[PDB]
Design a binder for this molecule. Structure first.
Ligand SMILES: CCCCCCCCCC(=O)OC[C@H](COP(=O)([O-])OCCN)OC(=O)CCCCCCCCC
Ligand SMILES: CCCCCCCCCC(=O)OC[C@H](COP(=O)([O-])OCCN)OC(=O)CCCCCCCCC
Ligand SMILES: CCCCCCCCCC(=O)OC[C@H](COP(=O)([O-])OCCN)OC(=O)CCCCCCCCC
Ligand SMILES: CCCCCCCCCC(=O)OC[C@H](COP(=O)([O-])OCCN)OC(=O)CCCCCCCCC
Lengths: 622, 622
């Protein structure tokens, strides 16, 4: 168990001016009783950095203890404690000391000074030589489940994540050791990545992150105008725009994608108003990192690399709405050509399976078996090529990619049935029939091409599968227990001869075909009737409970988001159709126009023109 | 693709003082560097109007570029640019120049000056001879789907639609070229039509339209008192009151229909308060264009020419509520006489079809066949006369006029069955039986005569048909795929012999009569049982999804509008019953009384007296 960072009740473990007297001095704050420590350290040839004066488990020095105990942001023992350290000839420094444990690794006194919101204590460390790039890489400072606080591991990133502009302003320009806006942590995250990382979708945190993101980006142009702070990638190869898309942060992603500035800081904009006429506003949006022409775009990340529930809200944002709409209109002919190629494949599949012989017409049947075999191999190779490129997509989006599983399973059992027809066995017919079911159920993937059938295919999957799958467990307990009961009691002659037959007769009560009768060919005829009556009452109550719960969870008056999920379904279809087939790869067509927008700190960007009509917003500006 | 109207990033296409130097001068605004253009134009004998100085795709001149770039509503290059144009001897003028493309056709500099809300630039063009009746008839300025802005194509209509009273006041009375309130566009729409056309049903736009409608109507009496601005019809023959009814604009239609003024502008009122006593207010409403005595009234337009979802909210407004109520009371005897004539027609239809011979009593049967034949011809001629006069009603109101289709189809198969009885064939009996079904289902049209059965017949059609019709598509895929599966697997002897028989046995599971058993006369008996079990589970889940979605879309706590839809159902019945039959045409009875209301700018109008009791509104006035 990790020890506490600061405790006025539990003393630090150990794993004349000793440590216990020293730590009590800096806690109380009076510096006059620090006399005698400098002479004691020179006599024993010891330093304040060594393990005798720090906490054994972590390495918390006396300067960290003094900073952890501040009165109105100032502690009178902080300034003189560095004087004993400097005058003792320490090869290390107390200001650059860090904890060495697994939980608070790299925690420094500058991090605690920034967290205490004491600008005076932050300044006092820098004038005495505090490194402003010291890293807190302990498990408390990583983002995980449980008790943690991720802020970007840097003093400048900590000041930005805690909303302290005076610390940020002092750390960026100071004549002793200025902080770099280009600094990174173990994840490769800069201060712009860290502001994305701390953000949830609440309005208050979103206002905090957006205000700090814009301010840091503007001060980046004043200090280091020759460096694009937005285009720095981490160790996972993600820009802050790409990192917001992967982690599903709806507010900071929308603000960066539609960033608008005027006058000064105008090259820091991704949106450019072009002309306005009444309720019509026409804008130009930057397609850098957004267009799917290049590798690992925002579109590819949202469609296949994001786990967040609000992926359908990122896809309907601007310019992602119009960019994918024009891409859909160029591929709607290819989508329906693929739909026509699957109708012919299943028209042949249905005709051949309908004319299967017992265990010209024979030549037409042999040609049909070849087309099924070649069609199965073509579908098998395409889906295997899909999972080789989309390896992590099916493990996070089973409710969004199960047709890729079903197309794979239908293709495998199609080929396997033809193998079981070459080597003559009876089992090829159940496999060919079951592939006839799975392929016909695969036509419903193509209902997303039309908006009408597409939004209907979204409203039907309201959250019913994993209620009905732990509905199954209680059901199967009721069914199995009553089934093994009925078989044992029916053995006495003076109906139910197996577990499977009794289970089928009990399942018939939920389809409206349950036989309820007073059988006279059984000794125990009252008790069987009471067991059947008890099962019917228990099942009807339990089915009634399941409706009542499904209605409490699904009729909620929350706005119907079936339009957005349908747009996400097309965006997956477009981004896969833009890669072509496995045998033929389509070339990538870039979107937008190369336009000059000003001067870089010329400034040529690939801009997408968006025409938007909004009568509501225009009337409020009158 | 149309080029942008104004772009600081994309230069205008081309489809010494050249165009590129000239367009940069008027964009920046300094007029001192315009020197040399007048001498250059006289040397080359060129003008500013020609295509060398305008955009090739559209025809955007330099004056349009100068107006598109205004600083605080004024550009210093606008006034001197007209001096080079005037001094060069141009047969045309730069102020009356218009774009020639398909998208911005007829766009002038006066339109941009009004849209920029610069009264100084609007004035400066008129003193130099800007035509105030120039027309913007391009596709951007027509009302359609996509990016557009319809305002009435006129400078006065543009100023009225953008809420600029100072531009409207200046354009109507100016000593150079005043604007006419009687001016029209290609649709025939005046400024009063255009204010109706731009209005949606939001409260903010409705307040904007009503305020501009009343103000323009009052200034019409001051400027041109001898012209009725409200009675001008467009090329579709619609007054602004009629145009609001056809496009379903609930707010501006109610305000015009119940317009009340006092003192001055009192002849501009359609409602006149007659006497008040406590909570009782008695008013007189103008029946001009409203009463169905004349052709193409508001009642005829609302019932048969409107596509808007809120047609039932226009019919319950005043005086439309009391006018149709008194018309219903004069026709409720004719409605029930028509109901009694259809009961006798179907009492004969049921008796004759019940006594059909094999393939006095014979004379009574022959008389019954004649009455069915004559009754079928009478119903066929009436419905064919209906669709000759109501040609566009059945194509926009299928959920409101399908009984006219069903009465037509029942009459056709009635006559066709008698034809197939004259030429002796066996197929007349299925047609006569199916006409017996369709005629009995046609009695439910007459349930709207009673309020009780009428409002019930409205609550039952909550929106369930087109959910259950794209519910059908997924269903039919499940049913057909499992049906062709079961037939193929049942061919091995050691049930389901056709697609139709298997489809019927699978459909029986949704009516509670599905047979689930372990058949021992089939080789593949486990796999058939698993296929049946999979079909039952898939169908039950999918039926459960359809209930959950129907309940999420229909129990919404929105107020029940079944009373208003029932009133719209009677209004269609009254307006069709007022035309009489096809053989006999009833004369039209005018409503209201001819009363003098003042002096026209005597003033005799056909006024409808409405007595209204409202205790709630009276108590707030105390
Ligand atoms: C190898 C070079 C020759 C190629 C042969 C011609 C193939 C045409 C390409 C094609 O249209 O395939 C469409 C379809 C793929 O479905 P999907 O991957 O889009 O959907 C995936 C969803 N997860 O594939 C099918 O539906 C089955 C294709 C086999 C039958 C072809 C019949 C042709 C009729 C003209
Ligand atoms: C291993 C064998 C498994 C066989 C399972 C066969 C299931 C077929 C898939 C199916 O039911 O059709 C899905 C259809 C459209 O879904 P979608 O494209 O919107 O979605 C695609 C991306 N989400 O929408 C529906 O019809 C759903 C209504 C029925 C639900 C049945 C639940 C299936 C599990 C019991
Ligand atoms: C040609 C000159 C002689 C005319 C013959 C007498 C016809 C009376 C007119 C009449 O009442 O017709 C009522 C009904 C029409 O229904 P609908 O158009 O109102 O509803 C239309 C809704 N879409 O029509 C019927 O129900 C069927 C009429 C045929 C049987 C008449 C039986 C008479 C019993 C007294
Ligand atoms: C080509 C052959 C087609 C035969 C279709 C037969 C349908 C008969 C019409 C009917 O069902 O009765 C309608 C009844 C009253 O409707 P309405 O007068 O309020 O409305 C008149 C103006 N809206 O209200 C109801 O009873 C509705 C409840 C049943 C709905 C059945 C849906 C029919 C399609 C499957």
């Amino acid at each position: 168990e990790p020890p506490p960072m600061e405790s006025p009740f539990q003393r630090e473990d150990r794993n004349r001016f000793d440590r216990d007297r020293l730590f009590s001095v800096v806690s109380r704050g009076v510096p006059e009783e620090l006399t005698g420590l400098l002479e004691y350290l020179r006599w024993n040839s010891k330093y304040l950095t060594d393990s005798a004066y720090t906490e054994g488990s972590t390495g918390k020095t006396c300067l960290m203890k003094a900073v952890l105990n501040l009165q109105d942001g100032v502690n009178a023992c902080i300034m003189p404690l560095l004087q004993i350290d400097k005058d003792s000839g320490n090869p290390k420094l107390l200001v650059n000391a860090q904890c060495t444990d697994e939980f608070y690794q790299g925690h420094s006194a500058l991090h605690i000074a920034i967290e205490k919101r004491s600008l005076q204590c932050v300044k006092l460390l820098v004038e005495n030589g505090a490194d402003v790039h010291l890293r807190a890489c302990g498990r408390f400072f990583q983002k995980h489940q449980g008790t943690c606080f991720y802020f970007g591991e840097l003093p400048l990133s900590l000041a930005a994540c805690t909303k302290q502009w005076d610390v940020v302003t002092y750390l960026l320009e100071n004549p002793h050791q200025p902080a770099s806006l280009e600094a990174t942590d173990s994840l490769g995250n800069t201060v712009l990545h860290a502001l994305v990382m701390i953000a949830d979708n609440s309005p208050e945190n979103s206002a905090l992150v957006i205000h700090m993101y814009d301010g840091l980006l503007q001060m980046g142009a004043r200090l280091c105008p020759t460096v694009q702070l937005e285009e720095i990638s981490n160790h996972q190869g993600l820009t802050p725009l790409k990192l917001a898309a992967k982690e599903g942060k709806i507010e900071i992603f929308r603000h960066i994608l539609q960033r608008e500035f005027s006058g000064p800081y105008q090259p820091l904009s991704r949106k450019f108003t072009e002309w306005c006429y009444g309720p019509v506003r026409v804008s130009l949006y930057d397609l850098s990192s957004v267009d799917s022409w290049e590798k690992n775009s925002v579109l590819e990340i949202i469609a296949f690399h994001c786990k967040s529930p609000n992926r359908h809200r990122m896809v309907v944002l601007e310019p992602l709405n119009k960019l994918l709409q024009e891409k859909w209109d160029r591929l709607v002919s290819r989508f329906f050509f693929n739909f026509a190629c699957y109708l012919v494949y299943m028209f042949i599949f249905t005709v051949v399976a309908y004319h299967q012989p017992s265990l010209f017409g024979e030549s037409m049947l042999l040609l049909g078996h070849i087309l099924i075999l070649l069609g199965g191999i073509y579908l098998l190779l395409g889906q295997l090529w899909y999972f080789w490129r989309r390896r992590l997509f099916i493990w996070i989006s089973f409710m969004d990619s199960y047709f890729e599983i079903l197309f794979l399973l239908q293709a495998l059992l199609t080929v396997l049935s033809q193998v079981l027809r070459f080597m003559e066995t009876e089992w090829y017919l159940p496999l060919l029939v079951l592939s006839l079911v799975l392929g016909w159920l695969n036509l419903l993937y193509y209902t997303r091409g039309f908006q009408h059938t597409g939004i209907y295919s979204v409203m039907i999957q309201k959250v019913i599968l994993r209620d009905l799958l732990r509905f199954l467990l209680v059901y199967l307990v009721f069914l199995f227990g009553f089934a093994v009961a009925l078989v044992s009691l029916s053995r006495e002659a003076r109906p139910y001869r197996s577990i499977l037959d009794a289970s089928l007769e009990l399942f018939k009560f939920t389809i409206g075909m349950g036989e309820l009768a007073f059988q006279e060919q059984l000794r125990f005829r009252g008790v069987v009737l009471l067991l059947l009556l008890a099962y019917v009452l228990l099942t009807y109550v339990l089915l009634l409970n399941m409706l009542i719960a499904l209605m409490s969870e699904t009729v909620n008056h929350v706005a119907d988001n079936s339009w957005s999920i349908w747009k996400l379904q097309k965006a997956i279809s477009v981004l896969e159709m833009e890669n072509g087939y496995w045998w033929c790869r389509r070339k990538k067509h870039r979107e937008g126009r190369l336009l000059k927008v000003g001067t870089r700190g010329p400034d040529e960007r690939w801009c997408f023109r968006v025409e938007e009509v909004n009568w509501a917003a225009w009337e409020k500006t009158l």
